[PDB]
Amino acid sequence: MPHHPHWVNEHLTILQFIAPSNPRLRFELNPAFDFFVAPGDVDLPGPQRPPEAMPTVNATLRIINGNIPVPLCPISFRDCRGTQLGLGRHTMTPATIKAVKDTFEDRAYPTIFYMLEAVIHGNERNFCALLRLLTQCIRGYWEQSHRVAFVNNFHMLMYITTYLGNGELPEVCINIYRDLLQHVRALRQTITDFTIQGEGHNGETSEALNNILTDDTFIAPILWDCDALIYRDEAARDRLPAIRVSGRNGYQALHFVDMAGHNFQRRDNVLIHGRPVRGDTGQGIPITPHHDREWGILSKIYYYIVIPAFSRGSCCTMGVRYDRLYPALQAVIVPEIPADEEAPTTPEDPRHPLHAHQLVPNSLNVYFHNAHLTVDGDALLTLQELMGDMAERTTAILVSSAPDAGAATATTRNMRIYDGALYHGLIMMAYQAYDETIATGTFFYPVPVNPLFACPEHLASLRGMTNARRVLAKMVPPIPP
Amino acid sequence: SHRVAFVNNFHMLMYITTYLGNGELPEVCINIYRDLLQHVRALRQTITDFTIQGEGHNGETSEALNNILTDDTFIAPILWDCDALIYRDEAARDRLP
Amino acid sequence: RVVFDPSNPTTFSVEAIAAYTPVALIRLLNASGPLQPGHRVDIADARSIYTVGAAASAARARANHNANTIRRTAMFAETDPMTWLRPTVGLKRTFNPRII
Amino acid sequence: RVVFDPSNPTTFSVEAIAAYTPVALIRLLNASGPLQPGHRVDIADARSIYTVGAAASAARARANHNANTIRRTAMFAETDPMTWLRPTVGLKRTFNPRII
């Protein structure tokens, strides 16, 4: 990288992007295209090492009308065409706005929530048994900080609003989540009037072609299930799909895993999701989709629009180092009650799991102290049912497919679009990088995929992030090739 | 008296939000330090936006050549630690200190 | 205590000792096996030992609670050959069944 | 009692004094030295030793309350001689050591 940072400066103005001194100006020929230099005699990833070959221009398509470089379609035009569009539709009140904002720009996020949000890994079963602890945590957070939590997953938002808006939480703190969901509901509903239905060609009906979030071949950066792939099989029936699971083309799956056959170091092209919540259990029907495509076309709109616009750029995903969370999640201290006695609620009783007696060094019960939560045995010991379901490892997958039928010509199929994304990963908030009470490089490690998730403050967490390296990260979105 | 305290120092302001930022003080007394940190962060934000990234010469980066604040060879009047001098010596290696 | 040994737990020593003690016991320790006794086979091995038996310790620590509580049931419909005339329903575990 | 003697406190007697009383002990005497029995040596030595003297005298003042309060646990990451298999987490000391 450090020789001639190229394709990097995007501060220029159209007055300057057209100057006779622009060394890039000679490469703008087809608005629906993007020209560049590349190594020749290569067609696919191959090795991680770029071979030797004289430079050669290739052809890539510009899909979205947002791809256009900034000094050709300035910010002002876009956020004014937005007003032209967003006329009189849903607008979120200053209350919820200030709330979620202060949530995002606060480095006081309890790490415990990251832990819990990760270890549940999306299944319905390991939620409907943990509900008590979740309400306790969210209450003990909001009702003292006035800041909601659990804004790092869409599965989580539609798992809360589906079963927790019945009074178990305050009317306004769940009104926040209700509003956040109905906002993206309206954001999908808007696209309906911008479409002319009734010309379903090659499967991709009218609703799905003009918009990427309506496309089921391009996936969110983070997922826990295989719904993307099970809708992908219905597509790509002529679009020449391409899969890659940690060095292997195919991919294998299981219905659900146990706590015994752990294998922290699985080598295969294997993937696991939570559980068939009904039906059968074994090898009769191997794979079952978790939800309907409407859950998908609603899944990634959140990730691609909402989280970005809220973080204001200070968002960067981090790949989980689970090998010290599932081992650490089973260091609980649950005190039982005598058969004839009641249950404490105050932290002044020696059988309240946050009493000044039950603090043990190197115990999972230190987190709730550091984040000042409320817990009981009923809500705590309801955690340890991870034997029925436990997600092993988070990997990255390279997928791809051809352009649509809309740009399907005899010269365009050799210009495939590649897609990488983390499975079982994690999208994270503003990074702190100035705490000590927890070991840094032990729980998560930053693996960016989307140039929306390339925050530089989220980089020192890697082992040996020397200063001689941190200088360029402030210029480029670092992405593993 | 509805008054924040320990603002005559910086390390107070950052230590507070890193450790005491979970509910041990009233929200109306900690949001103040939250917003102060946000303000210093926004001051930092505007600098890189008002400077061209990549024209660093002799090690010193863009913001090292644009503003006096990012130039690590400049020094705040109070040095609790000594890391300021460590950085100053790691920099200024050709400026005759 | 059981630290200098080539995986003597083997998913058995943990179903003996109650789960609340060892995390206090590890803090009292001073060093690991001064001869690298079991680190030859991956430490992921002793990991797949400790992290698979800690749950057995927790289960024996818990077993007194299934009597201190109501036996929990399913939360889905789970269509059963005898659901006719009584369509099954779920139940969200939020209450406090610990009997007082 | 140790006013007419050159550094003879030397954290040898003053740390026997309690931490509640000595405030009235030091603010008690008035008479200085004619030939300066406690000033022939500089004030930078008298005070240099009176610092540690009073500090020790107040140090013992909790030497009994340890049976009433909790010890001081580690609050940082602090890589453990047995750090492996156990993520060393610190504890944020804000608790109440009031325990009966």
UniProtKB/TrEMBL annotation, chain B:
- Ranges annotated as spanning the membrane: none
Entry superkingdom: Viruses
What name does this protein carry? Answer: Major capsid protein
Give the gene name: ORF40
Parent-protein start and end of this portion: 675 to 771 of 1396
From TrEMBL, chains C, D:
Subcellular localization, as worded in the UniProt entry = Virion; Host nucleus
Coiled coil ranges (UniProt) are none
Q: How does it assemble?
A: Interacts with the major capsid protein/MCP.
Function text: Participates in the assembly of the infectious particles by decorating the outer surface of the capsid shell and thus forming a layer between the capsid and the tegument. Complexes composed of the major capsid protein and small capsomere-interacting protein/SCP assemble together in the host cytoplasm and are translocated to the nucleus, where they accumulate and participate in capsid assembly.
Q: Which family does it belong to?
A: Belongs to the herpesviridae small capsomere-interacting protein family.
Q: Provide the protein name.
A: Small capsomere-interacting protein
What is the species of this protein? Human herpesvirus 3
Gene, per the UniProt record: ORF23
